[PDB]
Amino acid sequence: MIEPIKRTQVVTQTIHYRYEDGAVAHDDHVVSLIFTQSGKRDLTNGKEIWDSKWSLTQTFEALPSPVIIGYTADKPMVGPDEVTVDSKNFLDKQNREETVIYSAN
């Protein structure tokens, strides 16, 4: 006798926008990718069974950098970035984070 169980991993991408002097050039851009694997639990002995070869990939779509008059971003566009979560390393954080710098043109 088994029952369904599940687990979720959330990976987020945080993009910072600053000027060379460190001044915030634009609000941060945050997005998330939610990964959920299904499994079963034995009602008799409590064993949780997960498919060892389970794997899922999703993509943080390309994120064009905001255009700011008078300056130019060192990274005109961020991503795309493919993130994969598998059963064997399910509990491992993979959040992305970077900063785009604007230099007076």
Side-chain angles (χ1 to χ4, degrees):
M1 202 86 92
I2 67 169
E3 59 176 344
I5 54 170
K6 69 193 175 58
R7 55 175 171 176
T8 302
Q9 169 65 67
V10 186
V11 187
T12 78
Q13 179 190 60
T14 299
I15 304 297
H16 295 298
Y17 300 104
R18 295 188 163 188
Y19 287 103
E20 295 184 302
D21 53 14
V24 51
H26 188 296
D27 293 317
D28 296 335
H29 188 297
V30 187
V31 288
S32 166
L33 292 179
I34 309 174
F35 300 75
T36 294
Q37 167 177 26
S38 290
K40 303 292 172 192
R41 176 184 301 127
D42 195 294
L43 292 173
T44 301
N45 54 35
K47 179 179 59 181
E48 309 202 308
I49 301 82
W50 304 100
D51 188 313
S52 190
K53 299 296 183 181
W54 179 83
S55 190
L56 181 65
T57 296
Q58 299 191 73
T59 297
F60 279 125
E61 306 300 310
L63 187 70
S65 290
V67 179
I68 289 184
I69 304 177
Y71 300 79
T72 68
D74 57 355
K75 305 179 198 302
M77 180 188 93
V78 171
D81 189 352
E82 290 196 333
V83 172
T84 293
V85 170
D86 42 57
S87 188
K88 271 94 74 167
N89 311 293
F90 196 96
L91 306 157
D92 297 304
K93 300 179 166 309
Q94 311 189 56
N95 309 322
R96 333 302 243 199
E97 170 169 37
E98 52 179 297
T99 306
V100 181
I101 295 298
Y102 293 93
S103 293
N105 184 55

